[PDB]
Amino acid sequence: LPDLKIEKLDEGVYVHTSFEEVNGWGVVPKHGLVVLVNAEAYLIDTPFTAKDTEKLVTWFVERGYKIKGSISSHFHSDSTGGIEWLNSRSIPTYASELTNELLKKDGKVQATNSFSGVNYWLVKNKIEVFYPGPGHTPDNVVVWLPERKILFGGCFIKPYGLGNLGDANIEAWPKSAKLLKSKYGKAKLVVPSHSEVGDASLLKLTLEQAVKGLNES
């Protein structure tokens, strides 16, 4: 129910929070980012709804920033909710190939541009996308911002509990978390989708929950 929030996180980096009812978890807040790249902006994950997606887009257009593109970390509606609206406005949308396949599998609108592999540059030297392997979902990817040493973990970063295991790969999660931790331990900030912001320690906490998660199975 709470209204969308837009808080500046660091120079050129904003955190947008939307809220929505989630079967069994009640009202859950979702964090995404809006990266500024020379008068232009990029959305890292869309708000749950098309309305909040537009409010977000509009908020930044009024501040002088054209929306150059949007990237979704995984297929769950809390990262892809506003893709139909964005595409209708001809705004470039991106998602991994695995993500679009899952979106198509569940009867959802897909991103216009796909990509795959270990690393992919949405924007050279400014916005990099990394795939640690299956965990929260088979397709989950993270977003790295070299300049600000900021990492958007999305729904892969689950420091206090693995949450929604509906599409989780609990067998692979610990291996994927190990990979992510050694790759971005240099992170100054880690932004989770459902937890508050922290540092590189959130990578360790996630690894422990995953490990715990598999043992616990």
Q: Applying CB under 8 A, which residues contact its own copies?
A: 1-2, 7-9, 19, 21, 23-29, 160-161, 163, 189, 194-199, 201-202, 205, 212, 216
> Is residue 142 within 8 Å of residue 154, measured between CB atoms?
yes
Nearer to Zn ion, 12 or 135 (CB): 135
Q: Are 66 and 59 in contact (CB under 8 A)?
A: no
CA distance 11 to 104: 36
User: Which region, judged by CB under 6 A, interacts with ligand OPS, from 20-28, 37-45, 92-100, 198-206?
Assistant: 20-28
SS3 content of the chain, % helix, strand, coil (to 5): 25, 30, 40
Known binding residue 76? Answer is yes
Q: How far apart are CA 65 and CA 57, in angstroms?
A: 9
68 assigned to a ligand binding site: no
Binders of ligand OPS in range 107-146 (CB under 6 A)? none
Q: How do strand 13-22 and strand 5-10 relate by DSSP bridges?
A: antiparallel
* Piece of 9-17, 72-80, 96-104, 201-209 that binds Zn ion (CB under 5 A): 72-80
- Taking the least distance from each CB to ligand OPS, the nearer of 126 and 194 is 194
158 is in an annotated binding site: yes
- Residue 198's binding partner, choosing from its own copies, ligand OPS, Zn ion, none, with beta-carbon cut-off 5 to 8 A by kind? its own copies
User: Is 16 one of the annotated binding-site residues?
Assistant: no
Rg (CA), the chain: 16
Residues contacting residue 14 through CB under 8 Å, at least 6 positions apart: 6, 7, 8, 33, 34, 35, 36
Map the footprint of ligand OPS across residues 50-79, applying CB under 6 A.
76, 78
Q: Report the catalytic residues.
A: 74, 76, 78, 136, 155, 158, 164, 194
76 makes contact with Zn ion (CB under 5 A): yes
Residue 192: count of CB within 10 angstroms of its CB: 23
121 three-state secondary structure: strand
By CB under 6 A, what part of segment 82-111 binds ligand OPS?
none
Binding residues for Zn(2+): 74, 76, 78, 136, 155, 194
Give the footprint of ligand OPS on this chain (CB under 6 A): 22, 25, 28, 76, 78, 155, 163-164, 194
